Structure formats: structure tokens, C-alpha cells
């Protein structure tokens, strides 16, 4: 095989992988790091580890530090992959960011060129850049801060953003993204947002982060 080891799911694409679920990429190479991750191999060519879905309510995103650090859920269903891995991963490397959307019939995406994610000495600090896609450039407003939850709060606020909205997000004060927001709730900023396609009072069906290697958008 080309990646014996595959570090993410574009070098099990590489290798040959086609179908979309769960498969043990190995961060940096390192037989010793397996880590278990659903790969999307069909949405905008393929190779995307998700790191985030939403899709039906059953999993709860009102989650402290530690749990966001380490991850949590079905990650065949609603999950959180982990701040941990996030870092680790896109200190591999180029990454890009893709986030998918849908709706009621209707979808909308975004892509950032530029996505990184510092360790938790930068409280996992958010490097987002390069935008395109039609769901509207919301994440511009988060780029460079750190991630915040209930129990630790390093928002741009006087207030805790997240103990507010119930939630965690590299909130500033405090969002236009709130994919880890509360389920089908329509209240003012409390639902899975993404400002500039739905607004502030509609909580979206569907919604995935995923991210994989700049570069390979150009192979
Ligand atoms: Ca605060």
C-alpha cells in the first residue's frame, strides 16, 4: 500500500478506500497512534475526516473541557471527534476545513483553505482562513480564538458564551457559528447556527465539519 499507516482519510482514498465510514487512520504515521475516524469519501472528492454531525438530537453537546478535549459520541452518528485529535491532526500537515449543511431539501457549504487547531497550552486556538462555498463566510468571525466551554471560559465576553448558549465553540462574544448548539432550538443563538445562511433563530437539520489536506484538492 501507498500509506500502510494512513494518517487521515486522504491517504486511505489514496490507498484505495472509496466508501464512506469508519476507518483507523494512524496520526503521523505512528502504528502506535491509531485513531478510529468516519471518513466521508464522496462529498467534494472524497478523503474528509468528519470531526463533527449533527443530525437527529440524541446526543448532548452541553459538554465540559475535558470531554471536548478527549472527544465523544457514535461517531457513525452525532459525535465530537476531540480538540486533541483536531491538534494533532492538523499538525500534520496543510489541512483544509469543509462544512456541510442541509436543511429541510435545501444545502449550502463552506470551505476554508487554512484550518488549524494549537494544543491545549493555546486552549486550542482556531486558525480558520481562505473562504469559499455558499453558506456564507461565518467562521471569519472566530478565527483566531481559543475554545471555550461552561467550565472554562476564554470567550471575547464579560459574560460565559457558553454556560449562555449551553454549547462550546471558539465563542468571541459570542457567535456566528454554533454547530455544537442546542438541537431544533430556535431561540436567539441557542441552536445549531451558521449565521449567515439561516440566522440567529433557526436551529439546522444537518451539519458536518470535516476536515483533510489542502493540497489535495489539486491532485
Ligand atoms: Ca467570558
Known amino acids: 500500500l501507498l500509506y500502510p499507516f494512513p494518517k487521515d482519510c486522504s491517504q486511505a482514498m489514496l490507498n484505495?478506500?472509496?466508501?464512506?465510514?469508519?476507518?483507523?487512520?494512524?496520526?503521523?504515521?505512528?502504528?502506535?497512534?491509531?485513531?478510529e475516524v468516519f471518513c466521508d469519501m464522496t462529498s467534494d472528492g472524497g478523503g474528509?475526516?468528519?470531526?463533527?454531525?449533527?443530525?437527529?438530537?440524541?446526543?448532548?453537546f452541553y459538554q465540559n473541557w475535558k470531554a471536548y478535549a478527549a472527544g465523544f459520541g457514535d461517531r457513525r452518528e452525532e459525535f465530537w471527534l476531540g480538540l486533541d485529535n483536531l491538534n494533532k491532526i492538523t499538525a500534520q500537515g496543510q489541512y483544509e476545513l469543509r462544512v456541510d449543511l442541509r436543511d429541510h431539501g435545501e444545502t449550502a457549504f463552506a470551505v476554508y483553505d487554512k484550518f488549524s487547531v494549537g494544543d491545549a497550552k493555546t486552549r486550542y486556538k482556531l486558525k480558520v482562513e481562505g473562504y469559499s462555498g455558499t453558506a456564507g463566510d461565518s467562521m471569519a468571525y472566530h478565527n483566531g480564538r481559543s475554545f471555550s466551554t461552561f467550565d472554562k471560559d476564554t470567550d471575547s465576553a464579560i459574560t460565559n458564551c457558553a454556560l449562555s448558549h449551553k454549547g462550546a465553540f471558539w465563542y468571541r462574544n459570542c457567535h456566528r457559528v454554533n454547530l455544537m448548539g442546542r438541537y431544533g432550538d430556535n431561540n436567539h443563538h441557542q441552536g445549531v447556527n451558521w449565521f449567515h445562511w439561516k440566522g440567529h433563530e433557526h436551529s439546522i437539520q444537518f451539519a458536518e465539519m470535516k476536515l483533510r489536506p489542502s493540497n489535495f484538492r489539486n491532485l
Open 16 to 35: 484505495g478506500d472509496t466508501t464512506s465510514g469508519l476507518y483507523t487512520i494512524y496520526l503521523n504515521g505512528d502504528k502506535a497512534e491509531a485513531l
Open 48 to 60: 474528509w475526516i468528519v470531526f463533527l454531525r449533527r443530525k437527529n438530537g440524541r446526543e448532548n
